[PDB]
């Protein structure tokens, strides 16, 4: 059963009637001297897909809206985090305070640990997997 | 047509094959309901596992699509890492175009390496796919390449041969009377309410109900630990200095129906289905394993049950269809 995972970008961006999607997730609306530039990143990318079948940034050529190229993405059971961003029901929810990232690395240290577990058994007293961030819920 | 054919190896894992890439390269992959994700063995991959299984190679595909995104995935017995990549996915006769996939970069354990299957094919709710990458499923329908939203799953016993996915659509042959529909608790994994598991009318778990997912990728009926553990002394099932859980092979022609309930629909598990006859040694299926979620402990209803019922995953109005397998 899936339980977590993490990556990198870059994400994928997409533009929909000035709303801007990273990883499917809803990261921010356009608006005034954005809504062009978003019309615009939305064909470069369609041009990049159906034409040159190139996904490397150098044909789409992501704006700032598309948010930092190089951030991190986790994802738990009904609930993820990308760049600085909390989701939760793929909604935003707020901005990860310094007590969500402690959370998250605490995370990651207990799945790192779960993991040599389960890929070694040739659980008697042994771990289970852990219970999502607090930050996940309410 | 438009199904997808599963070998059955030991009664344990069940695989299907694909084609990726122009021209085709075959793998063979679990179809999970239990996650999201599509990915295979890579001729990037340099975990032990990968030195025995297909691995694909880019380079000989005319419509592979590179990209630099990288993730790591964990699941209940494991884990992967890999870089994403768009090709043409060919699945239950149907040919999947820019089908986001990953190519693995690692997948440590010896079970990867005495698996008799390539990879993996996810078939959750796209909300617990790894970077939000979109599951084949999703993309089949998106591309209009299935009829229905659905798909329906048979899990032959006794090692049979016959088990097979039916991606948009489902057969009245594989099943006898009418399905009964379960609506879906919550969207991610095929999540479902599970109102009691009684036997002699007696609660022995999951007491005022419990939330439980129907998993394809699991083998065992599993549930919290401190609740199998009840489970176990309820049905005569000891541990032993080895592990294994061992079970009276007489047992089974006396025991009780473990019955769940669901949505007012009693679903009976006789012991000639939870107890695992290999030989002449018997062994529980049930499995403690704790699954903290924010929908509280998980229950995993893997093929020990699956194999009771033709489960139909119905995405077009979120529900599970169940029915006793023909």
């Given at each position: 059963?899936?339980?977590?995972?993490?990556?990198?970008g870059?994400?994928?961006?997409?533009?929909?009637?000035?709303?801007?999607?990273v990883?499917?997730?809803?990261?921010?609306?356009?608006?005034?001297?954005?809504?062009?530039?978003?019309?615009?990143?939305?064909?470069?990318?369609?041009?990049?897909?159906?034409?040159?079948?190139?996904?490397?940034?150098?044909?789409?050529?992501?704006?700032?809206?598309?948010?930092?190229?190089?951030?991190?993405?986790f994802?738990?059971?009904?609930?993820?985090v990308?760049?600085?961003?909390?989701?939760?029901?793929?909604?935003?929810?707020?901005?990860?305070?310094?007590?969500?990232?402690?959370?998250?690395?605490?995370?990651?240290?207990?799945?790192?640990?779960?993991?040599?577990?389960?890929?070694?058994?040739?659980?008697?007293?042994?771990?289970?997997?852990?219970?999502?961030?607090?930050?996940?819920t309410? | 047509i438009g199904?997808?054919?599963?070998?059955?190896?030991?009664?344990?894992?069940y695989?299907?094959?694909?084609?990726?890439?122009?021209?085709?390269?075959?793998?063979?992959?679990?179809?999970?309901?239990?996650s999201?994700?599509?990915?295979?063995?890579?001729?990037?991959?340099?975990?032990?596992?990968?030195?025995?299984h297909?691995?694909?190679?880019?380079d000989?595909?005319?419509?592979?699509?590179?990209?630099?995104?990288?993730?790591?995935?964990?699941?209940?017995?494991?884990?992967?890492?890999?870089?994403?990549?768009?090709?043409?996915?060919?699945?239950?006769?149907?040919?999947?175009?820019?089908?986001?996939?990953?190519?693995?970069?690692?997948?440590?354990?010896?079970?990867?390496?005495?698996?008799?299957?390539?990879?993996?094919?996810?078939?959750?709710?796209?909300?617990?796919?790894?970077?939000?990458?979109?599951?084949?499923?999703?993309?089949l329908?998106?591309?209009?390449?299935?009829?229905?939203?659905?798909?329906?799953?048979?899990?032959?016993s006794?090692?049979?041969?016959?088990?097979?996915?039916?991606?948009?659509?489902?057969?009245?042959?594989?099943?006898?009377?009418?399905?009964?529909?379960?609506?879906?608790?919550?969207?991610?994994?095929?999540?479902?309410?599970?109102?009691?598991?009684?036997?002699?009318?007696?609660?022995?778990?999951?007491?005022?109900?419990?939330?439980?997912?129907?998993?394809?990728?699991?083998?065992?009926?599993?549930?919290?630990?401190?609740?199998?553990?009840?489970?176990?002394?309820?049905?005569?099932?000891?541990?032993?200095?080895?592990?294994?859980?061992?079970?009276?092979?007489?047992?089974?022609?006396?025991?009780?129906?473990?019955?769940?309930?669901?949505?007012?629909?009693?679903?009976?598990?006789?012991?000639?289905?939870?107890?695992?006859?290999?030989d002449?040694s018997?062994?529980?299926?049930?499995?403690?394993?704790?699954?903290?979620?924010?929908?509280?402990?998980?229950?995993?209803?893997?093929?020990?049950?699956?194999?009771?019922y033709?489960?139909?995953?119905?995405?077009?109005?979120?529900?599970?269809?169940?029915?006793?397998?023909?």
């Open positions: 059963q899936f339980l977590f995972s993490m990556s990198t870059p994400f994928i961006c997409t533009v929909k009637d000035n709303q801007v999607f990883a499917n997730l809803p990261w921010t609306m356009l608006e005034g001297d954005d809504i062009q530039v978003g019309k615009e990143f939305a064909a470069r990318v369609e041009d990049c897909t159906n034409v040159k079948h190139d996904m490397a940034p150098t044909c789409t050529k992501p704006p700032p809206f598309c948010g930092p190229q190089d951030m991190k993405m994802n738990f059971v009904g609930c993820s990308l760049g600085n961003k909390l989701f939760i029901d793929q909604k935003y929810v707020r901005d990860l305070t310094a007590k969500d990232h402690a959370e998250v690395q605490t995370f990651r240290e207990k799945i790192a640990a779960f993991e040599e577990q389960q890929e070694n058994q040739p659980p008697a007293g042994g771990l289970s997997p852990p219970p999502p961030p607090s930050f996940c309410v | 199904d997808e054919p599963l070998e059955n190896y030991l009664d344990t894992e695989f299907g094959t694909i084609g990726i890439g122009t021209p085709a390269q075959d793998f063979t992959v679990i179809f999970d309901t239990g999201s994700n599509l990915w295979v063995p890579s001729v990037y991959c340099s975990s032990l596992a990968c030195s025995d297909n691995q694909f190679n880019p000989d595909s005319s419509t592979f699509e590179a990209t630099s995104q990288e993730l790591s995935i964990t699941y209940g017995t494991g884990s992967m890492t890999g870089i994403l990549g768009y090709d043409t996915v060919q699945v239950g006769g149907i040919s999947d175009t820019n089908q986001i996939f990953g190519l693995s970069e690692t997948e440590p354990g010896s079970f990867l390496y005495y698996a008799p299957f390539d990879g993996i094919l996810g078939l959750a709710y796209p909300s617990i796919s790894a970077s939000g990458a979109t599951p084949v499923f999703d993309n329908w998106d591309q209009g390449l299935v009829s229905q939203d659905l798909f329906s799953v048979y899990l032959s006794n090692d049979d041969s016959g088990s097979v996915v039916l991606l948009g659509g489902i057969d009245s042959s594989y099943y006898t009377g009418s399905l009964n529909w379960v609506p879906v608790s919550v969207e991610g994994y095929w999540q479902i309410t599970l109102d009691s598991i009684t036997m002699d009318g007696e609660t022995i778990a999951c007491s005022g109900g419990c939330q439980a997912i129907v998993d394809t990728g699991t083998s065992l009926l599993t549930g919290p630990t401190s609740a199998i553990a009840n489970i176990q002394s309820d049905i005569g099932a000891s541990e032993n200095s080895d592990g294994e859980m061992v079970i009276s092979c007489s047992s089974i022609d006396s025991l009780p129906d473990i019955v769940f309930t669901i949505n007012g629909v009693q679903y009976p598990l006789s012991p000639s289905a939870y107890i695992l006859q290999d002449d018997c062994t529980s299926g049930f499995e403690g394993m704790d699954v903290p979620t924010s929908s509280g402990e998980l229950w995993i209803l893997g093929d020990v049950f699956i194999r009771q033709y489960t139909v995953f119905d995405r077009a109005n979120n529900k599970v269809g169940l029915a006793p397998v023909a």
